[PDB]
Scaffold this active site. Structure first.
Site, PDB file in Angstrom:
ATOM      1  N   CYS A   1      42.402 -69.193  11.787  1.00  0.00           N
ATOM      2  CA  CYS A   1      43.537 -68.573  11.965  1.00  0.00           C
ATOM      3  C   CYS A   1      45.031 -68.983  11.043  1.00  0.00           C
ATOM      4  O   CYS A   1      45.411 -68.416  10.346  1.00  0.00           O
ATOM      5  CB  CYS A   1      44.143 -66.584  13.023  1.00  0.00           C
ATOM      6  SG  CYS A   1      45.071 -67.136  13.901  1.00  0.00           S
TER       7      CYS A   1
ATOM      8  N   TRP B   1      41.173 -63.084   8.126  1.00  0.00           N
ATOM      9  CA  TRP B   1      39.874 -62.494   7.949  1.00  0.00           C
ATOM     10  C   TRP B   1      39.077 -62.045   6.868  1.00  0.00           C
ATOM     11  O   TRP B   1      37.937 -62.196   5.703  1.00  0.00           O
ATOM     12  CB  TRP B   1      39.407 -61.926   8.348  1.00  0.00           C
ATOM     13  CG  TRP B   1      39.954 -61.906  10.208  1.00  0.00           C
ATOM     14  CD1 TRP B   1      39.504 -62.990  11.150  1.00  0.00           C
ATOM     15  CD2 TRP B   1      39.605 -60.935  11.622  1.00  0.00           C
ATOM     16  NE1 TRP B   1      39.491 -62.794  12.024  1.00  0.00           N
ATOM     17  CE2 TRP B   1      39.661 -61.985  12.361  1.00  0.00           C
ATOM     18  CE3 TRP B   1      39.630 -59.894  11.474  1.00  0.00           C
ATOM     19  CZ2 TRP B   1      39.788 -61.412  13.847  1.00  0.00           C
ATOM     20  CZ3 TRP B   1      39.429 -58.915  13.010  1.00  0.00           C
ATOM     21  CH2 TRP B   1      39.839 -59.792  13.741  1.00  0.00           C
TER      22      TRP B   1
ATOM     23  N   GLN C   1      38.497 -65.877   6.830  1.00  0.00           N
ATOM     24  CA  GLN C   1      37.928 -67.102   7.792  1.00  0.00           C
ATOM     25  C   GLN C   1      36.624 -66.635   8.279  1.00  0.00           C
ATOM     26  O   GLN C   1      36.166 -65.557   8.292  1.00  0.00           O
ATOM     27  CB  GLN C   1      38.767 -66.526   8.865  1.00  0.00           C
ATOM     28  CG  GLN C   1      38.667 -67.199  10.692  1.00  0.00           C
ATOM     29  CD  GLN C   1      39.575 -67.190  11.470  1.00  0.00           C
ATOM     30  OE1 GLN C   1      40.794 -66.402  10.659  1.00  0.00           O
ATOM     31  NE2 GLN C   1      39.715 -67.057  12.889  1.00  0.00           N
TER      32      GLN C   1
ATOM     33  N   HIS D   1      47.144 -63.150  16.436  1.00  0.00           N
ATOM     34  CA  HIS D   1      46.257 -63.847  15.333  1.00  0.00           C
ATOM     35  C   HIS D   1      47.424 -63.767  13.212  1.00  0.00           C
ATOM     36  O   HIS D   1      49.062 -63.114  13.891  1.00  0.00           O
ATOM     37  CB  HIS D   1      45.279 -62.663  14.573  1.00  0.00           C
ATOM     38  CG  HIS D   1      44.632 -62.510  13.477  1.00  0.00           C
ATOM     39  ND1 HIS D   1      43.746 -63.433  13.295  1.00  0.00           N
ATOM     40  CD2 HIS D   1      44.556 -61.841  12.452  1.00  0.00           C
ATOM     41  CE1 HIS D   1      42.767 -63.718  12.333  1.00  0.00           C
ATOM     42  NE2 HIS D   1      43.675 -62.584  11.497  1.00  0.00           N
TER      43      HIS D   1
HETATM   44  C1  NQG Z   1      43.829 -66.959  15.258  1.00  0.00           C
HETATM   45  C2  NQG Z   1      42.500 -66.721  15.315  1.00  0.00           C
HETATM   46  O1  NQG Z   1      41.122 -67.740  14.481  1.00  0.00           O
HETATM   47  O2  NQG Z   1      42.058 -65.349  14.969  1.00  0.00           O
HETATM   48  C3  NQG Z   1      40.563 -65.709  15.331  1.00  0.00           C
HETATM   49  C4  NQG Z   1      39.924 -64.699  14.098  1.00  0.00           C
HETATM   50  C5  NQG Z   1      43.857 -68.195  16.091  1.00  0.00           C
HETATM   51  O3  NQG Z   1      43.497 -67.483  18.036  1.00  0.00           O
HETATM   52  C6  NQG Z   1      45.493 -69.135  16.529  1.00  0.00           C
HETATM   53  O4  NQG Z   1      45.746 -69.802  16.047  1.00  0.00           O
HETATM   54  N1  NQG Z   1      45.766 -67.919  17.826  1.00  0.00           N
HETATM   55  C7  NQG Z   1      47.414 -68.843  18.291  1.00  0.00           C
HETATM   56  C8  NQG Z   1      48.358 -67.473  18.302  1.00  0.00           C
HETATM   57  C9  NQG Z   1      48.578 -66.416  16.361  1.00  0.00           C
HETATM   58  C10 NQG Z   1      48.848 -67.503  15.623  1.00  0.00           C
HETATM   59  N2  NQG Z   1      49.486 -68.162  15.188  1.00  0.00           N
HETATM   60  C11 NQG Z   1      47.215 -69.591  19.718  1.00  0.00           C
HETATM   61  O5  NQG Z   1      46.356 -69.666  20.313  1.00  0.00           O
HETATM   62  N3  NQG Z   1      48.584 -70.319  19.910  1.00  0.00           N
HETATM   63  C12 NQG Z   1      49.550 -70.324  19.461  1.00  0.00           C
HETATM   64  C13 NQG Z   1      50.848 -68.863  19.412  1.00  0.00           C
HETATM   65  C14 NQG Z   1      51.656 -69.267  18.161  1.00  0.00           C
HETATM   66  C15 NQG Z   1      52.431 -67.685  18.817  1.00  0.00           C
HETATM   67  N4  NQG Z   1      51.955 -66.641  18.707  1.00  0.00           N
HETATM   68  C16 NQG Z   1      51.643 -65.884  18.590  1.00  0.00           C
HETATM   69  N5  NQG Z   1      52.829 -64.662  18.125  1.00  0.00           N
HETATM   70  N6  NQG Z   1      51.091 -64.800  18.969  1.00  0.00           N
HETATM   71  C17 NQG Z   1      50.372 -72.240  19.974  1.00  0.00           C
HETATM   72  O6  NQG Z   1      51.194 -72.038  20.412  1.00  0.00           O
HETATM   73  N7  NQG Z   1      49.298 -72.806  20.069  1.00  0.00           N
HETATM   74  C18 NQG Z   1      49.297 -73.591  20.629  1.00  0.00           C
HETATM   75  C19 NQG Z   1      47.952 -75.082  20.341  1.00  0.00           C
HETATM   76  C20 NQG Z   1      47.198 -74.665  21.851  1.00  0.00           C
HETATM   77  C21 NQG Z   1      46.948 -75.761  22.812  1.00  0.00           C
HETATM   78  N8  NQG Z   1      45.970 -75.299  23.475  1.00  0.00           N
HETATM   79  C22 NQG Z   1      45.866 -74.059  23.358  1.00  0.00           C
HETATM   80  C23 NQG Z   1      45.599 -72.692  24.567  1.00  0.00           C
HETATM   81  C24 NQG Z   1      45.746 -71.553  23.869  1.00  0.00           C
HETATM   82  C25 NQG Z   1      46.461 -70.932  22.161  1.00  0.00           C
HETATM   83  C26 NQG Z   1      46.820 -72.206  21.736  1.00  0.00           C
HETATM   84  C27 NQG Z   1      46.730 -73.782  22.060  1.00  0.00           C
HETATM   85  C28 NQG Z   1      50.470 -74.743  19.698  1.00  0.00           C
HETATM   86  N9  NQG Z   1      51.714 -75.259  19.969  1.00  0.00           N
HETATM   87  O7  NQG Z   1      50.425 -75.066  18.860  1.00  0.00           O
END
Ligand code: NQG
Ligand code: CA
Ligand code: CA
Length: 322
Positions: A83, A266, A77, A240
């Site tokens: 991620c 990563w 990444q 992540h």
């Molecule tokens: C991961 C990454 O790049 O690592 C950095 C080095 C990246 O931040 C990521 O995708 N994060 C996810 C959580 C982990 C996963 N997969 C995230 O921010 N949001 C999603 C949560 C999934 C469940 N999480 C965990 N088990 N921790 C999520 O639902 N995303 C939303 C899209 C979205 C829209 N607006 C926002 C604002 C903040 C965050 C996400 C979003 C979706 N419905 O798909």
């Protein structure tokens, strides 16, 4: 046979660029700031400013599409919060048949090269062929976003660019859910599991999913905001997506212990608990199992016991195909 996204025709485009002595420039996703993003990566932003669009054929004398196979070590990444997408691509590589549907055979920087590549995705309720030109965001001569552990390999950078194209920009990819990319690569059925309420047969389900080439990822919910850092005391990253890449059983001081293997997209930064690369546990399994399963290498990829996995992680996602 895949239908053409936006009516763009890979073979006709490639042939016509070759005939006319040019390399493809993609009007649909061009090499400008609006393909990067709109805010965190907009024209007016600090990230955007040093980024220059360059082809792998401008970077290196001998760029390769695929080197030593398309494998999960090719997914490291970059500076984008995609991620979820990259965990999915790393998982995708474990199923050769699905992998080479998304990533068509025959693509190269040598014979027949004209600055254009193509990938297939499940989108809009169809299998779609998406073309990209090979102009990539770079800074100081290095890819800014996804790259392979082989610095001369480009298929994964090009796939991530194609996936950005369908969503509008790279920035559009910031924050997502692993199951969404699983679908877009399979057209299959996603299920998730609450690891704090895991069923008793969850290790069996994982083993059977892995056997049949289903795609598996896992993640740790940030339950209080980001209130212990993103990185835990045992070196795990919260919020992540990780790829789940194996499940295997070892004889630990004469008893079987169920293990599970995951990879941080990563390509570095690993669990430092029991069954980690330098943990003592490996001293106490039989030599053969140890040398079949343990790889001492900072590659992002590591073993946990299943007991530790279900304590440390909060969510598992499984996408089953046909
Ligand atoms: C991961 C990454 O790049 O690592 C950095 C080095 C990246 O931040 C990521 O995708 N994060 C996810 C959580 C982990 C996963 N997969 C995230 O921010 N949001 C999603 C949560 C999934 C469940 N999480 C965990 N088990 N921790 C999520 O639902 N995303 C939303 C899209 C979205 C829209 N607006 C926002 C604002 C903040 C965050 C996400 C979003 C979706 N419905 O798909
Ligand atoms: Ca490779
Ligand atoms: Ca490792």
């Amino acid at each position: 046979n895949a239908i053409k996204y936006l009516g763009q025709d890979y073979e006709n485009l490639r042939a016509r660029c070759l005939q006319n002595g040019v390399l493809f420039q993609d009007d649909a996703f061009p090499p400008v700031s609006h393909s990067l993003g709109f805010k965190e990566l907009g024209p007016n932003s600090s990230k955007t400013y040093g980024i220059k669009w360059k082809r792998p054929t401008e970077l290196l004398s001998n760029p390769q599409f695929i080197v030593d196979g398309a494998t999960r070590t090719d997914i490291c990444q970059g500076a984008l919060g995609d991620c979820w997408l990259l965990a999915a691509i790393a998982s995708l590589t474990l199923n050769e048949t699905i992998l080479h549907r998304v990533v068509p055979y025959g693509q190269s920087f040598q014979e027949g090269y004209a600055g254009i590549f193509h990938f297939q995705l499940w989108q809009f309720g169809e299998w779609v062929d998406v073309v990209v030109d090979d102009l990539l965001p770079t800074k100081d001569g290095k890819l800014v976003f996804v790259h392979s552990a082989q610095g001369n390999e480009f298929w994964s950078a090009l796939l991530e660019k194609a996936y950005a194209k369908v969503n509008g920009s790279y920035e559009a990819l910031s924050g997502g859910c692993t199951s969404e990319a699983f679908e877009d690569f399979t057209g299959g059925v996603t299920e998730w599991y609450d690891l704090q309420k895991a069923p008793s047969d969850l290790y069996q389900i994982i083993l059977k999913a892995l056997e049949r080439g289903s795609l598996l990822g896992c993640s740790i919910n940030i339950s209080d905001i980001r209130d212990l850092e993103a990185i835990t005391f045992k070196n795990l990253v919260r919020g992540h997506a990780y790829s789940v890449t194996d499940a295997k059983q070892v004889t630990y001081q004469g008893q079987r212990v169920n293990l599970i293997r995951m990879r941080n997209p990563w390509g570095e930064v690993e669990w430092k608990g029991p069954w980690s690369d330098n943990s003592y546990e490996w001293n106490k399994v039989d030599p053969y199992e140890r040398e079949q399963l343990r790889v001492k290498m900072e590659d992002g990829e590591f073993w946990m016991s299943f007991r530790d996995f279900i304590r440390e992680f909060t969510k598992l996602e499984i996408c089953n195909l046909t």
